[PDB]
Amino acid sequence: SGFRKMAFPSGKVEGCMVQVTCGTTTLNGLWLDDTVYCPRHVICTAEDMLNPNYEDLLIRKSNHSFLVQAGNVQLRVIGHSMQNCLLRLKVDTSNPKTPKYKFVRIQPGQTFSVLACYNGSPSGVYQCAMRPNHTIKGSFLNGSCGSVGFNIDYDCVSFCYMHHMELPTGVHAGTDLEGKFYGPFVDRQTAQAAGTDTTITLNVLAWLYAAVINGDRWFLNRFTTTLNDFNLVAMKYNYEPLTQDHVDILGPLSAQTGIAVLDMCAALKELLQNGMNGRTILGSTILEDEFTPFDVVRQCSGVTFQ
Amino acid sequence: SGFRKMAFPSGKVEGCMVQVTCGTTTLNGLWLDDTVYCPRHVICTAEDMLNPNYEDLLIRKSNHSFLVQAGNVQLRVIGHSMQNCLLRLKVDTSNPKTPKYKFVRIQPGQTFSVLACYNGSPSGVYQCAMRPNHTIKGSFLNGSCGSVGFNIDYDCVSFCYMHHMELPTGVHAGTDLEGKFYGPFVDRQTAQAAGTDTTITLNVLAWLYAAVINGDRWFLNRFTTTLNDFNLVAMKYNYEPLTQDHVDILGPLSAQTGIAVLDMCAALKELLQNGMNGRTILGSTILEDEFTPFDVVRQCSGVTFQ
Ligand SMILES: Cc1ccc(S)c(S)c1
Ligand SMILES: Cc1ccc(S)c(S)c1
Numbered sequence: 192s193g194f195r196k197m198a199f200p201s202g203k204v205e206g207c208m209v210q211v212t213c214g215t216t217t218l219n220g221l222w223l224d225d226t227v228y229c230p231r232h233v234i235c236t237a238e239d240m241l242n243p244n245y246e247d248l249l250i251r252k253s254n255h256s257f258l259v260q261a262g263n264v265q266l267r268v269i270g271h272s273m274q275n276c277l278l279r280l281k282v283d284t285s286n287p288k289t290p291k292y293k294f295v296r297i298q299p300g301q302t303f304s305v306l307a308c309y310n311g312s313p314s315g316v317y318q319c320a321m322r323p324n325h326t327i328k329g330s331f332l333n334g335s336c337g338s339v340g341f342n343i344d345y346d347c348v349s350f351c352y353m354h355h356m357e358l359p360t361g362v363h364a365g366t367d368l369e370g371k372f373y374g375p376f377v378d379r380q381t382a383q384a385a386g387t388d389t390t391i392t393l394n395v396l397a398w399l400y401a402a403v404i405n406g407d408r409w410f411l412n413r414f415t416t417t418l419n420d421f422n423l424v425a426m427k428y429n430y431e432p433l434t435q436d437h438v439d440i441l442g443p444l445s446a447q448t449g450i451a452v453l454d455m456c457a458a459l460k461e462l463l464q465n466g467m468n469g470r471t472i473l474g475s476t477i478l479e480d481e482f483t484p485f486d487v488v489r490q491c492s493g494v495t496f497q
Numbered sequence: 498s499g500f501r502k503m504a505f506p507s508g509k510v511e512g513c514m515v516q517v518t519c520g521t522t523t524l525n526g527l528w529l530d531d532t533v534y535c536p537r538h539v540i541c542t543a544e545d546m547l548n549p550n551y552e553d554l555l556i557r558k559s560n561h562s563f564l565v566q567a568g569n570v571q572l573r574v575i576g577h578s579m580q581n582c583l584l585r586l587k588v589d590t591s592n593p594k595t596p597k598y599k600f601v602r603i604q605p606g607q608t609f610s611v612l613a614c615y616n617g618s619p620s621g622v623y624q625c626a627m628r629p630n631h632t633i634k635g636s637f638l639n640g641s642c643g644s645v646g647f648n649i650d651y652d653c654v655s656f657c658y659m660h661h662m663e664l665p666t667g668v669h670a671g672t673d674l675e676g677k678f679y680g681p682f683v684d685r686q687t688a689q690a691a692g693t694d695t696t697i698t699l700n701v702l703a704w705l706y707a708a709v710i711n712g713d714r715w716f717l718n719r720f721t722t723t724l725n726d727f728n729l730v731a732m733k734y735n736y737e738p739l740t741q742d743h744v745d746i747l748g749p750l751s752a753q754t755g756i757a758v759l760d761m762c763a764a765l766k767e768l769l770q771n772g773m774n775g776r777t778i779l780g781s782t783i784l785e786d787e788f789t790p791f792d793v794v795r796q797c798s799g800v801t802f803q
């Protein structure tokens with residue numbers, strides 16, 4: 192039946208994207224009710240970025256220093272304030288397309304959909320995982336700042352990421368919708384770099400369960416393992432240590448497949464020590480760590496192929 | 498800067514999805530202007546599928562044998578006809594969310610975005626390539642029939658696929674929006690199976706160009722090759738033969754990177770004969786064939802890293 196990295200339908204978010212311009216800088220903003228949220232560096236010039244003092248740069252702006260464009264309409268700013276690394280612009284109009292929503296700060300290992308945008312116009316959508324090192328391997332070009340990440344539950348959009356910068360290795364960093372950065376990054380020019388990363392163990396296990404639900408059992412084995420013995424192998428292969436909380440989370444998947452979590456860990460240990468011998472799992476030649484246990488339950492059938 | 502399999506924003510299509518029920522069968526339909534399009538097998542029962550005569554099964558239905566639900570509203574059918582493998586239901590209301598659109602029959606190797614839907618409610622979006630063997634490796638569960646594939650240019654939605662069935666190997670088959678199947682498949686129960694497939698050479702080359710644009714040149718070499726000598730290697734590795742039309746298509750990418758097409762073919766030939774030696778390209782350990790030259794130009798920077 193297939194297994195794909197799928198994103199949430201993006202319509203509810205497309206209706207919230209606008210363009211924000213201050214001086215010569217234009218980037219994207221998120222328009223919810225009567226507020227537009229955007230990266231605070233929209234107020235900076237290239238030189239400002241070397242050592243910007245945002246409090247000082249901002250007090251020098253007025254409400255009209257900001258130009259907000261929604262589609263083909265101009266929104267009038269009637270207030271502004273800084274909240275951590277974001278600017279909150281109050282506008283004269285409430286977005287009629289505002290969806291039911293909330294702001295959530297996602298945890299490392301969790302996934303979300305990104306709606307890449309330029310000049311307030313959505314251009315593409317794809318799924319990303321927040322890495323343990325607090326970066327995401329997105330696809331972004333100049334002008335994408337302010338693009339957002341989100342999940343959708345029922346008809347409530349949980350916004351969890353706003354894009355702010357690209358690091359030397361080509362990976363990306365940003366904030367939650369309260370403007371607090373994920374990771375130790377800052378919105379200014381420094382020698383900052385992505386720290387060391389690690390494979391998301393819980394997700395790789397979830398994905399092996401997805402492969403079984405979809406009818407594949409070739410990588411299973413007759414062994415079991417202790418959490419501690421598993422972690423000795425995990426440390427060697429740069430996998431996050433597995434905890435009992437992670438084992439508990441895998442409970443439902445374990446029950447749907449009849450495969451005990453620690454027995455699946457034994458299967459993983461063997462895959463790490465012996466490789467995959469030219470075989471594939473769910474079409475992949477490598478162990479995938481960008482699907483959470485939740486993503487698997489969402490996409491896979493509730494009935495294992497058996 | 499990253500490279501992801503990204504789909505087109507799905508909003509314009511979400512506003513067109515509805516549910517169509519005939520008897521005990523419910524699947525998805527596409528509502529454009531005053532017409533709803535859906536798989537004709539919605540009129541069949543399980544037994545009907547063994548050897549259905551659609552002309553005979555359909556003449557036995559009336560306009561009211563069909564229930565069309567848009568969100569929470571019931572649409573009244575005032576006409577119906579069969580067009581190849583689809584049903585075209587005329588309804589009493591014109592969709593106010595109808596986007597500018599057109600129906601296109603995509604060619605093998607080309608890509609499109611799929612909006613997976615159930616009960617007329619969009620659940621996810623992902624990018625697929627139409628394989629040379631006319632199937633797509635989608636992610637679909639029971640109830641997904643009628644889900645559509647599309648591309649978006651400017652603000653015109655080009656619909657190119659409607660989902661109808663899953664084959665024994667777990668891959669998927671469907672039709673264009675005139676109801677003609679892609680491939681030799683039929684909407685009934687038979688021993689039909691996906692034919693042999695092949696790697697999409699032109700796309701793998703496009704992707705190697707994307708990797709160079711993004712700053713990576715490790716797999717290049719000092720050799721060149723003739724189209725014929727390249728094809729002898731392609732035949733051995735089950736790659737589609739490269740033609741001069743394919744070489745011409747790669748012209749712009751070749752110019753942006755300063756790498757002659759046949760020299761890039763020499764690089765591919767070497768990658769196929771020697772493997773990738775534990776290295777990755779654009780984060781991948783394998784040669785990717787699901788990005789067209791058009792997808793690359795769309796997502797990559799217009800300035801090579803150099
Ligand atoms: C050069 C440059 C211009 C605009 C933005 S928003 C950034 S992050 C960098
Ligand atoms: C069992 C079954 C029920 C409904 C549809 S639309 C199909 S394709 C198969």
Ligand SMILES: [Zn+2]
Pocket residue numbers: 218230232336355
């Ligand atoms: Zn920026």
Ligand SMILES: [Zn+2]
Pocket residue numbers: 524536538642661
């Ligand atoms: Zn069906």
